[PDB]
Amino acid sequence: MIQKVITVNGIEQNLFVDAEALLSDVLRQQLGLTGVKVGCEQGQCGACSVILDGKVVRACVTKMKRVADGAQITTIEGVGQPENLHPLQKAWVLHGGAQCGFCSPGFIVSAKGLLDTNADPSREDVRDWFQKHRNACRCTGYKPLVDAVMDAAAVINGKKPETDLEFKMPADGRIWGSKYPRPTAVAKVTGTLDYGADLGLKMPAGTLHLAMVQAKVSHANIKGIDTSEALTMPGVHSVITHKDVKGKNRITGLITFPTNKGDGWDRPILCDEKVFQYGDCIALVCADSEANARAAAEKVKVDLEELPAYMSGPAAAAEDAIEIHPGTPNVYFEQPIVKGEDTGPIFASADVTVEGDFYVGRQPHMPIEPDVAFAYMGDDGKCYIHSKSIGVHLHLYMIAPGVGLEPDQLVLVANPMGGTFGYKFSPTSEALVAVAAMATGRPVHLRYNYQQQQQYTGKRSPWEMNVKFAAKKDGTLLAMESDWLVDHGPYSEFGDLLTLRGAQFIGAGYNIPNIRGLGRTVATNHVWGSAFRGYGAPQSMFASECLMDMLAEKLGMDPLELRYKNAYRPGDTNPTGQEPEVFSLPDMIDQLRPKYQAALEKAQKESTATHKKGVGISIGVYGSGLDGPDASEAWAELNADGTITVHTAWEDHGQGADIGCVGTAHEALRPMGVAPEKIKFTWPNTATTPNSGPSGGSRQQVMTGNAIRVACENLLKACEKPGGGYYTYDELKAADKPTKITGNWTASGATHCDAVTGLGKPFVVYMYGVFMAEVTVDVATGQTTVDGMTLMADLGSLCNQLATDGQIYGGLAQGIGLALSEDFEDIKKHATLVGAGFPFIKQIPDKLDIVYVNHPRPDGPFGASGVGELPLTSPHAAIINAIKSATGVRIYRLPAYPEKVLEALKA
Template sequence: MIQKVFFVNGIERNIIVDEESTLSDVLREQLGLTGTKVGCGQGHCGSCNVLLDGKVTRTCVYKMSRLPEGAKVVTIEGIGTPEKLHPLQKAWIKHGAAQCGFCTPGFIVSAKGLLDTNPKPTREEVRDWFQLNRNACRCTGYIPIVDAVMDAAKVLRGEMNEKELEFKMPADGRIWGSKYPRPTAVGKVTGTLDYGADLILKMPKKTLHAALVQATVSHANIKGIDASEAEKMPGVYKIVTHKDIKGKNRITGLITFPTNKGDGWDRPILCDEKIFQYGDAVAIVCADSYKNAVAAAEKVKLDLEVLPAYMSAPEAMTDDAIEIHPGTPNVYFTQKIRKGEETAPIFSRSDVVTVEDDFYVGRQPHMPVEPDVGFAYTDHEGRLVIHSKSIGVHLHLAMIAPGLGVEPEKLVLVTNPAGGTYGYKFSPTLEALVGAAALATGRPVNLVYDYRQQQAYTGKRSPFWTNVRLASTKDGKLLGMETDWTVDHGPYSEFGDLLTLRGAQYIGAGYDIASIRGEGRTVCTNHCWGAAFRGYGAPES
């Protein structure tokens, strides 16, 4: 431990810290300044930026042992407040530069550092500055952000009246069609809007911190789980396994199509018999601190019988491939399309031009700046309450309630203020995990993914292998199309049939093609499970 004396937003702070703690940890956990957000935790996204002695600094990788005595730190809270916004914050609101808002404090702090040193930057210099300081935004496309910096700079130079940055209600009082600011804009630009990890820091002291015991192989039978050593580790309250879950221990696909050869009950909350993909959760360590939970999770021993891992649809479709879910074929859903007259005679005609090609659209991570986060507790009415980044709380309630063994009227799901999810939260991720932990311990439990977990253990865009044949007249009039597409949806079937249907709907969409024949299929693999992504099937098609 070391003592540090430094200034934060003009206030002298004299505190004892762990020299290995990061500046972001100290600002957020010891000083309560949660406007500084932690995204990647590796210094790549800029959401944790502050000014340290006037220099933009990524606090998630800045150890307290490096902090000079008397250093001057400026966080988003020191730039402006909801009652007294800085021109940068007003410009951010005006241009809609705060969309999900998770990255916004880091951008505004970074922009302040730029304008303090370069009061009249060009647009290219603004973009170069953000790239230099690793500021990443997944929502805006950066144009509104650069617009905001340029307008704020004009105000600070005296070339624009600050009131021009403020919204004026139209004379007729109509908001529709205006640039009315989003209701959360002030909270986002001042860092006062609490996202999931911020809310966790404000939970009661008895709240437990969770760490997952996860598979490091992609396919295996589980022969045993030994938590005896982990249970003796400091701070451990309970280690939750599938044996503690009172319900079916499965997340249902809910809207499984009637012709799907599976039943939709294929995704475990905590794996009991098999590992289906890398990162699958086998146990949850609940402890008095995140550090203690992680240390104990590393001591849980898994006895596994490793099985062949099929990391692509073609591998899982081979004749000698075993069924990933015993009793359900790896090709578990087929979708056909039939429109107009038969295509074979059209393609055989001598007066038509035919073309054929193969296309592959790969698996794609959503890359949110805010990693997955959630917490759960039992409320005063005996209901299990789960807070998360869910974008479908009613859907997710129905998907996880039977698995947890909770009646729907006794389960409440709440969406926290959340960083953009871009579709991956159309599938439940950690909701059932924190719910199971809260039920098993009788205590509030929180779970925050690091970025490796975000990448490995949330759904991704599913790859498509697609073959398309087109027939046209010699002057380019399309006459027929034949299609074949294969969807690698990972090990869990939820929405896989729906996504495969999108191939039938979208391949060739927008063109007048009188005759179409095609067939697509959904394939179970041991790669990361498939989830919704922007466009949902359109980019792949």
């Protein structure tokens, strides 16, 4: 041990440390500076950026021996605090740079390091700096972060007043449609929002820290578990196995389709008889710290009989393949799509037909924050789980039978969280922590490291797809045929539903009167499928939007004009036979056309012998809602102090559940003149908030937005004075009148898609868009650079522009990763951010352009649709279409790795 007297955030610290300790651990654990965020723990994400003697370093890879006596350290806490914000923090709030906020302290500290060395940076300088310092963001697409640094620099340089970094009310008084900052932004930019790992550090002594004993093979029969050595190890309390589970020890898929060949109870909580994928949790070590638990977990011995593993859909789906779940065939679900007339004869007599085989893979969500949760037994005897769940009520019912509790005896709460992008539509650690809290009776906390986040949370499910179009010479689509195989890994939850998305979205955007297709779901031993933003559309529309360009090529027609010819217009129906609710695609295409023409001409002009430029188009469509007559509930409450609490379980991945609530409520409450700062939101809690439903299917703005609207409308009526005006709280209480008022809303017109035909009206609101990608391909290396992305977006009406701009930029960036670099195929190699192709800032163009072409939705609140998943529906198709435009080669199987592109170029 050594004494180190240094200065941290301007204050002398008399530090006592191990020379080998990591600065991140010292700052967080010894000094309580939890504003230093830790994600990857491998120097790759920049979340733990601190300033050490004028240099920006990653604290997670900086040992204390590198900190000199008398060193100066600055963390986010030293940059600024609430009510003492630095211009960088004010700028972040104003520009909406804090979505999940997990990367915000690191970016801001890093940015301070930049401005202290280069006071007047170009945008390019800012981007170079964040690239060098590895500052990673998965939510924002980086553009808002650069915007914030530039605005801050102008103020610091005296070129602009600081008051200009503060939001100015539109004087309208209207915050709906505005750039009003989100309520949580100040906490996020000051590092004073506690995420799950921060909470763990602030839990009492006596809290047990958990480590997972995980399978190190993909498939096995388990013969036994020996915990003997683990029990003798430092700090170890106990080891938990399936024997300690008080219920079924299975998670239920809950809404498993009746035509599913499996019962939906396939997923264990702790493995008992079998390992189904690499990483499966077999036991939990409980110890006095994460470190001691992890050390002891290494010594737990599992005796198993390894079985041959099926590591792809085609492999598991072979007629001969052995059943992974004995008694259920590996191909456990099929969804037909049968619209209009038989397609065979139509293909035979059509002027032109095209066909392609396409693949989209096992995309990893890669939030900067790895999975974390905790549980305890309340004094009330209930078991409480606090996690990254984005569907607290959904997960309660998925896990309660498995853990052995009635619904009344379990409470799920959503912690502030550093992004999910859908992986948290699935339970991950909730049943694990519940089992441990129940068994020990103690508080328990479980933090996944980044390798566990990669290997042992769900993934976008790979689809092998064959799609065909028949059309007339003039481009009019006549028929489509489709076949898709969905590799869902071993656990069935929502696999059948994901397969149904193929019937709804392959070929979406166009009038296609005649469709014959079949989707199949197959269990494998690769990572289990959990929703990934777009959920079936990124696969489906990659195929159909690539195939549209192939059809255009074969016709000798411009690909934008072929889309224009076929795009939804009144009288048309979508693939499930339903009439679209608005018709915005022709409008969007017409508005994009000259920008597209200009982009083509720039590409031809700027292409060289070695660097070929191209332009690519695609359309995106997706539902806002869960299938059928989805519903939500909210309570609007007038409080004693004149503030109003809008109670919902709108789960915040980081997308903006707080601002969605506040902006929708503000608009609804306008008759009563309620200032936005007086409107409070509620963190999701199954005990004390209504069942608003999960934050999945880009549904909350529509479903919960409408419920909030209804609740606020009803509160207005509850407050109305006879004669005009409104009662105050004190008046209503003195009159013994209610002050907490319920609102409910249901998507009444929606119906579930039929199990035989796939036809139905699954959503009453959809999101529509048109993408344009501009790219440069180095033909010597096969490397593609995306130089610009454009999204024409119809969101009906914007609740908040900071929220919607950021959503689109974030989805576009994920689209660049899906197109060019991302996968989870190799269990080890893809278990790091850099290994799995995470897009760092230079991979995302500074030019991310949005054009809103909003057609108010009949059923959306104030006409709004959702936005969440729109920007990831097909941007990767536009990019691949742009590569084809540039070079003449088509990549059918994502991602377009340089070597793959070179092989295609040289073929």
